[PDB]
Write an enzyme that holds these catalytic residues in place. Sequence first.
Site, PDB file in Angstrom:
ATOM      1  N   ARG A 123       0.808  -1.104  -0.053  1.00  0.00           N
ATOM      2  CA  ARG A 123      -0.020   0.130  -0.027  1.00  0.00           C
ATOM      3  C   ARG A 123       0.937   1.312  -0.082  1.00  0.00           C
ATOM      4  O   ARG A 123       2.086   1.150   0.084  1.00  0.00           O
ATOM      5  CB  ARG A 123      -1.008   0.085   1.110  1.00  0.00           C
ATOM      6  N   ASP A 137      -3.593  -0.960   8.217  1.00  0.00           N
ATOM      7  CA  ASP A 137      -2.680   0.093   8.758  1.00  0.00           C
ATOM      8  C   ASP A 137      -2.094  -0.410  10.125  1.00  0.00           C
ATOM      9  O   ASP A 137      -2.626  -1.370  10.785  1.00  0.00           O
ATOM     10  CB  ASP A 137      -3.473   1.366   9.018  1.00  0.00           C
ATOM     11  N   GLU A 147      -3.586  14.436   3.956  1.00  0.00           N
ATOM     12  CA  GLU A 147      -2.334  14.173   3.195  1.00  0.00           C
ATOM     13  C   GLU A 147      -2.553  15.059   2.150  1.00  0.00           C
ATOM     14  O   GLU A 147      -3.428  15.311   1.245  1.00  0.00           O
ATOM     15  CB  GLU A 147      -2.562  12.540   2.461  1.00  0.00           C
ATOM     16  N   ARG A 197      -6.457  16.359   1.087  1.00  0.00           N
ATOM     17  CA  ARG A 197      -7.404  15.428   1.215  1.00  0.00           C
ATOM     18  C   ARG A 197      -8.220  16.275   2.382  1.00  0.00           C
ATOM     19  O   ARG A 197      -7.529  16.631   3.444  1.00  0.00           O
ATOM     20  CB  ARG A 197      -6.881  14.052   1.558  1.00  0.00           C
ATOM     21  N   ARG A 224     -13.877   4.672  -3.321  1.00  0.00           N
ATOM     22  CA  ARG A 224     -12.640   5.080  -3.880  1.00  0.00           C
ATOM     23  C   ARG A 224     -12.304   4.329  -5.409  1.00  0.00           C
ATOM     24  O   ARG A 224     -11.885   3.039  -5.315  1.00  0.00           O
ATOM     25  CB  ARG A 224     -11.684   4.465  -2.945  1.00  0.00           C
ATOM     26  N   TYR A 277      -5.049   5.157  -3.504  1.00  0.00           N
ATOM     27  CA  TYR A 277      -3.675   6.036  -3.272  1.00  0.00           C
ATOM     28  C   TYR A 277      -3.020   6.262  -4.430  1.00  0.00           C
ATOM     29  O   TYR A 277      -3.052   5.127  -5.131  1.00  0.00           O
ATOM     30  CB  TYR A 277      -3.046   5.589  -2.034  1.00  0.00           C
TER      31      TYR A 277
HETATM   32  C1  LIG Z   1      -1.775   3.771  11.799  1.00  0.00           C
HETATM   33  C2  LIG Z   1      -1.608   5.039  11.152  1.00  0.00           C
HETATM   34  C3  LIG Z   1      -0.370   5.870  11.075  1.00  0.00           C
HETATM   35  C4  LIG Z   1      -0.151   7.061  10.177  1.00  0.00           C
HETATM   36  C5  LIG Z   1      -0.941   7.329   9.188  1.00  0.00           C
HETATM   37  C6  LIG Z   1      -2.336   6.609   9.335  1.00  0.00           C
HETATM   38  C7  LIG Z   1      -3.391   7.033   8.398  1.00  0.00           C
HETATM   39  N1  LIG Z   1      -3.996   5.851   7.377  1.00  0.00           N
HETATM   40  C8  LIG Z   1      -4.711   6.335   6.353  1.00  0.00           C
HETATM   41  C9  LIG Z   1      -5.079   5.482   5.335  1.00  0.00           C
HETATM   42  S1  LIG Z   1      -6.721   5.170   4.687  1.00  0.00           S
HETATM   43  O1  LIG Z   1      -7.447   6.531   4.300  1.00  0.00           O
HETATM   44  O2  LIG Z   1      -7.572   4.542   5.885  1.00  0.00           O
HETATM   45  O3  LIG Z   1      -6.859   3.895   3.453  1.00  0.00           O
HETATM   46  C10 LIG Z   1      -2.670   5.356  10.276  1.00  0.00           C
END
Ligand SMILES: Cc1cccc(CNCCS(=O)(=O)O)c1
Length: 658
Positions: A207, A232, A503, A519, A581, A615
Site C-alpha cells: 500500500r 494500517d 494528506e 485531502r 474509492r 492512493y
Molecule cells: C496507523 C496510521 C499511522 C499513520 C497514518 C495513518 C493513516 N491511515 C490512512 C489510510 S486510509 O485512508 O485509511 O486508507 C494510520
Amino acid sequence: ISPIFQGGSYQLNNKSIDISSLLLDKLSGESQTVVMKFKADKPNSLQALFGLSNSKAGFKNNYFSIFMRDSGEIGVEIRDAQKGINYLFSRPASLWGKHKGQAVENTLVFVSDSKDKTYTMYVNGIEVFSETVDTFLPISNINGIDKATLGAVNREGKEHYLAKGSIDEISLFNKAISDQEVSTIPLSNPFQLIFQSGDSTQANYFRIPTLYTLSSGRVLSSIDARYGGTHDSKSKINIATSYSDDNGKTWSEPIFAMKFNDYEEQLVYWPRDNKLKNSQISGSASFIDSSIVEDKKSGKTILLADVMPAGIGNNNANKADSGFKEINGHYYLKLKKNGDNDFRYTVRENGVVYNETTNKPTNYTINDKYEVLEGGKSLTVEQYSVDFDSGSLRERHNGKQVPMNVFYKDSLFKVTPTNYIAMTTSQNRGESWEQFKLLPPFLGEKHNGTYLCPGQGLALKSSNRLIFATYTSGELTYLISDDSGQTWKKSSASIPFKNATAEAQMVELRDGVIRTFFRTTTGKIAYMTSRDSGETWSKVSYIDGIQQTSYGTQVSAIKYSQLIDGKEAVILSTPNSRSGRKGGQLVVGLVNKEDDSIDWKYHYDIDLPSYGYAYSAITELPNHHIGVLFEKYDSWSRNELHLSNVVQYIDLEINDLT
Ligand SMILES: Cc1cccc(CNCCS(=O)(=O)O)c1
C-alpha cells in the site's frame, strides 16, 4: 496439451450464445482448465461470462459459471443440489476495463483440479484465489448438465446473469494445467507490477505507493510492504524501494529502506472471511507512509516514513506525548525500562541511557540503529512468527535471536507508544539506504508528533530548500531544510478541520510559488499557496469539478515540464467519486498567469468509473511520459481488504490525457 475446445470473436450483447453441441460431449474426466481472453468496458452490474448448467425445470441450482461484477470482481459458482454443494469463490478488484480509452483484453485462466481438490483463478497473470475443499465437485460432474453457454447462465430455460462484453478467445482443457504452464500463457496487460507477492520483500500485500524521478534519469519508488494483510499499523510493515533506469520499462528487485526485525518477514495469506479479516499482527513495530525527495546540492536521495513501536498504531498512539523530553532547549528520546510504571530514562548524547530520577548515567547505551547495548555488548530478543494454524492468529517466538531494539515489545528499554517520524538517505540513488534517524518534535514536548504526507517531498528548483509536508489536527506542518536535511524547521499552516487525515502534496507553480493539494473531510480536494518558498501559507480554498468521499483519499500532483495549450500545466491524480474509492483520474490544469488560478481542462479516466482507484503516485518520466503507480482497488472498503497485486504501474503520454 491441446484444447478440447477452442473458439472466439464472440460478441455478448445481452444475448447468450449456445455452444453446447461444440463443447459438452468433449468434456471428460474430473479436471478442467478454462482459458479466456475477454473484454468488458461496459459490464452489467452482475454478469456471467461462461456457464455450464442443467437447464431442466427444478434444477436451477445445478451449474458452473464464471462471473464478474461491474466493481471488477471475478469469481465462480459450482453448484449441485443433489450433492448438496454450493461453492462460491471470488475476489474483488481483479479486472481491467479500459486503458487509453480502449477496452482491455483480460486473460483469465481457471484451473479445476480434482487431484488436489483445488480451484484456482488467475486474471491478467495474477492468482486472485486458490481454494481447497474437502469435497471436490468437477465442473463437468454437475448433475444433469445439458447446456454450455457464453454471456449467460441458462437456468430452467431462461437467461440469467446476461452479459455485456466480448470473448475474443475461449479454450478448454481436460487437464488441470500446472502453475508453470499457466505462466507461459501470453498476456495483454495494460499494466506492470513493480512490487509483487513473492518478491524480495516477502510481503503478500502493498500500500501507499510513491514515485520520484531523480536527476540522473533513474525513477525511484517506495511503498508500504504490508505483511499482516493491508491493515494500517498495528501490523508489520517495512518500507521497500525499487528503481527503473529505462523510463519505467523494468524495475529493480526491491530492497528495504526501513525495516524492523522483531517479527519475521513472512508471505502470509490473510483471511478474508468476516470472522477473521480484522486479525492484526499486534506485537510488531512498523513503519507506514513513506515520502521521497532528491537534494540537488549533495546528490543524496531522502526518504521519510512514520515509525511505530510494537503494538502501536493510530488508535493507541499516545496523543499527549511527543516521546521526547526537553532539557535546556534540547530534545531527548524518553525510555521506559522493563518493570517501571513511568519513563525514568532518556537517551542523551552518544546514546548514553540516563536515569532521570538520579541524573546518573547507566551502563546501557543506544546505538545508531536504535539497538540496546550494555557495556558495549549488544543485547538480543527472540523473533516472532505468525500463523493461523490453530484457527485464529498466533504470534509465537520462533527461536531466532535478533538485536534488541527500543521499538520492540521484548526490549528492556522501550520508547513512548506514539507515532514518530524517521528519515533515511541513499548516496547511490536507492541501491542502498542508511540507518534511519528520528526527527525531533516540532510542535513541542507535550504534543504527539505530526503525520507524514506520503508521496513526494518538494525540492525547490531555484534553491537548496527541501520541504516535506505533514499533517496533524488543525494544521498542515511543513518540514523545511536548507542544509540537505541535516536540520529541519517547521512552517505551520492552519486548516479548518479537527482530526482530518490531511494528506497533502505540493507543486511548484513557478520559482518560489508552491501550491499544496490536500485531502479533507468535505468531499472536495482543498488547496493553499505559498509565495515565499513555504515560509508562509495562504488561506484554504477548494477545487470544484472533482469529487471525493466524506473520508477522502490521498491525491498526487506534479508540475508538468512542458506547456500545454501554451500554458503552465499541473497534473492531479485522484479518485473522482462521492461514493467510494473508484473512478481514477488524472486531471490536467492550466495555470492562469494573471492570478495563479487553475482551469481544470482535461479529465483522464484511468479505467471505468466503477473500477477501484485509491492512493496514487505520478511522476514525469525523463522522456516526458507520465508514470502512475496506484492502488487499483478500494482500500477503504471493508470488502476489499487483503488483495494481492493491486498496486499497479502504467505508462501514459500527454496526448492520451488530452
Ligand atoms: C496507523 C496510521 C499511522 C499513520 C497514518 C495513518 C493513516 N491511515 C490512512 C489510510 S486510509 O485512508 O485509511 O486508507 C494510520
